[PDB]
Amino acid sequence: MTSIHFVVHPLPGTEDQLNDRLREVSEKLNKYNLNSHPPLNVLEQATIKQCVVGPNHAAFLLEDGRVCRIGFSVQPDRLESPVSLGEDLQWWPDKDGTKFICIGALYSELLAVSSKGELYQWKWSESEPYRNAQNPSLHHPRATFLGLTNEKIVLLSANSIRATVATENNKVATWVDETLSSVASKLEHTAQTYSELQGERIVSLHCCALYTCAQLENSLYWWGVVPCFQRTPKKLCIPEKTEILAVNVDSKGVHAVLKTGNWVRYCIFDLATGKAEQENNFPTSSIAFLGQNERNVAIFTAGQESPIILRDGNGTIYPMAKDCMGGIRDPDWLDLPPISSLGMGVHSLINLPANSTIKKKAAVIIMAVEKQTLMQHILRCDYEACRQYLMNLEQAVVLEQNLQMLQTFISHRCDGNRNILHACVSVCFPTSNKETKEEVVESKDRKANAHFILKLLCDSVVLQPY
């Protein structure tokens, strides 16, 4: 099971401010252990594939094919939880019984792609998605113009202003928000398979207001207005025999994570030279960043002007900050379970009084945080809860039941690739010389309980083989 948490951050801001938002959040999971609000409790047992923010609504795609959306409000308590939701959640008016494969967003409307490859339009102000009474498979009024009424869509990327798709037939197509229709005549293009993209499949798409990049099986290509029209896809100067782990875009250019044999480096690419304008090594081990499943690597970003969230091969938020040379600071750990999926979006704050210290913009971030129940008891120093869990896991071993639950717990990680015993040890750390001079859980009991927990874990027949 997972839990959904909401985070808000003014823009522009800083990486360590953001890390402190995550830190602030990370406290609550181990101090309050509060019950989740009803409106989204239905999603705790659900599996979430993708999460997104439109200008006034969140929306979620489930692995079971269902989609839903919900309007949101920022709490004045941090216009100064920072977020409050309505109790009315809207499930997709699926009168066809057709499941969805991915979703995306534009300023006027939600976007969705069905498993049939059909394109759906649903304006945020509408109670139902668009349907053509004269064409039951046409769920987007401009799909005819794009040729997409006869082309199965298989990938989408869309952020406020621009939307780009790949068809199963490798044809690219691109459209823009309705308010841009007066300039769209020079920005949009129908379903076309560019010769520069022939020879590789589009593996993912990275859209923004000015341009889109396509990530292909062994190369990167991009087109649109430069960060002035790159009219046809342009190849980037990718080094040979290298594997590309993830990619994303902003007004600054392209950001991507490159492997090279056992090495990993973080890279900013410039579309003018087509080469990397900066590379940095990480201060940690590279293998630690690659984790247990490399495919988990990502680079979530808010959009334009954005904060960044790297993710490791286990699902950790990697706690980046620049150093004062412009390299990478050591990882200022955050003590978090892995994030199964994460939504981001940019929100206007013109709703504020004009005197405000918080700026006219913030990011809204939506986190499907995973529930590591026994890891939380260790971190909470709840000695009795840890003991009870071990007693139940002991019964589980004797009864030969929920054995996968035990293996899953043993395989749990939080950030920095710390297993349970690293978590115990970190908890046992001293915090002041006043404590040694003198020599929610109180600090005195915190150390005592942590040491008793460490001893208990070292003693338990549950853990002995591990």
Swiss-Prot record:
Annotated positions of the N-acetylthreonine modification: 2
Residue positions where Phosphoserine is found in the record: 81, 306, 426
Tissue specificity comment: Widely expressed. Most abundant in testis and expressed at high levels in brain, pituitary and kidney.
Superkingdom assignment: Eukaryota
Location of this chain's protein in the cell: Nucleus; Cytoplasm
Assembly and oligomerization: Homotetramer; composed of a dimer of dimers. Associates with CDK9 and TFIIS/TCEA1 and forms a transcription regulatory complex made of CDK9, RNAP II, UBR5 and TFIIS/TCEA1 that can stimulate target gene transcription (e.g. gamma fibrinogen/FGG) by recruiting their promoters. Associates with the E3 ligase complex containing DYRK2, EDD/UBR5, DDB1 and DCAF1 proteins (EDVP complex). Binds TOPBP1. Interacts with PIH1D1. Interacts with CIB1. (Microbial infection) Interacts with human T-cell leukemia virus 1/HTLV-1 protein HBZ; this interaction modulates HBZ stability.
Function: E3 ubiquitin-protein ligase involved in different protein quality control pathways in the cytoplasm and nucleus. Mainly acts as a ubiquitin chain elongator that extends pre-ubiquitinated substrates. Component of the N-end rule pathway: ubiquitinates proteins bearing specific N-terminal residues that are destabilizing according to the N-end rule, leading to their degradation. Recognizes type-1 N-degrons, containing positively charged amino acids (Arg, Lys and His).
Family under the similarity heading: Belongs to the UBR5 family.
Written domain comment of the UniProt record: The UBR-type zinc finger forms a pocket that mediates recognition of type 1 N-degrons.
Protein name as annotated: E3 ubiquitin-protein ligase UBR5
Organism: Homo sapiens
